[PDB]
Specification:
The structure is cut from a larger assembly and holds two copies of chain A.
Chain A lengths: L18 E2 L2 E2 L5 H7 L3 H9 L1
Helix pairs in contact in A: 1-2
The complex binds adenosine-5'-triphosphate (ATP) and magnesium ion.
The site of magnesium ion (MG) has 3 residues of chain B, from loops.
Family (chain B): Belongs to the ABC transporter superfamily. ABCC family. Conjugate transporter (TC 3.A.1.208) subfamily.
Protein name (chain B): ATP-binding cassette sub-family C member 8
Organism (chain B): Homo sapiens (Human)
Chain lengths: 49, 229
Amino acid sequence: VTIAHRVHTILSADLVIVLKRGAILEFDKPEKLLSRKDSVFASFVRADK
Amino acid sequence: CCVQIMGGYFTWTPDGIPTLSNITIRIPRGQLTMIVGQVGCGKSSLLLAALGEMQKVSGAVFWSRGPVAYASQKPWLLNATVEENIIFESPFNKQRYKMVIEACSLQPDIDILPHGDQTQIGERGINLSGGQRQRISVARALYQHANVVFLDDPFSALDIHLSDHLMQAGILELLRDDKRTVVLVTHKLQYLPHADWIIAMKDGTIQREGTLKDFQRSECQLFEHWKTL
Ligand SMILES: Nc1ncnc2c1ncn2[C@@H]1O[C@H](COP(=O)(O)OP(=O)(O)OP(=O)(O)O)[C@@H](O)[C@H]1O
Ligand SMILES: [Mg+2]
């Protein structure tokens, strides 16, 4: 169970869980999360890459 | 023209192995230069040697000494008032103070402190999280108002939001000074085409030095840099 300061390293995970200020936001596989573009994870991986 | 060390040999113990050997370093006047390398490769050691913390087995350090602002790798605060240790015995300036803090993004973290700005923290006061310690350590050097500011892995306990904010605001403010050299080492090569000079090293020994027209000499090292897109 990983905590990531590098969203690019967590990319190889089986399931990614996103956290807002106190709750999960749509735990899912990384592919769908990055493809949705509505995920905050998309903003992360796009501002970091 | 500024700080330079030709063929330096530095060590920790005068009987052990000469940890750093055959180094040639340059830091231009009023620029932004970074140092990178592997883990434990010796990226803080060169710096502490160029700060006078290592008996040089050989070589020659040349300056201009000066009250160089600094932030150790592990952030370290004082057993005193938050204002008192971010100021650090400087003539208090409301404008510069608030500007530095906004640059370090500490206002929402100050608001949660019981006495706000004048909260008495330290090893005797109330304790807090490593992110705030790191930000205070950076603010101490930013408010320091020294010619050669100097950082050591500030982007360690910081996420992407706060790292972006600090980098952008603080470092662009530093560059906004007519002449204010700042030297920060980091692991994220993300901000390479923002640094005016680059120093890469491995196993202590330096490899290359040059920002763009020198990063075109080989594809192995530059591909290693761009491995993370
Ligand atoms: N305070 C110390 N006392 C003794 N040896 C040290 C000390 N600090 C570092 N060393 C040794 O010197 C070598 C270089 O250490 P240095 O602190 O430069 O690592 P670094 O590359 O800056 O760290 P990081 O990779 O975490 O940024 C290391 O192999 C370490 O074993
Ligand atoms: Mg180090």
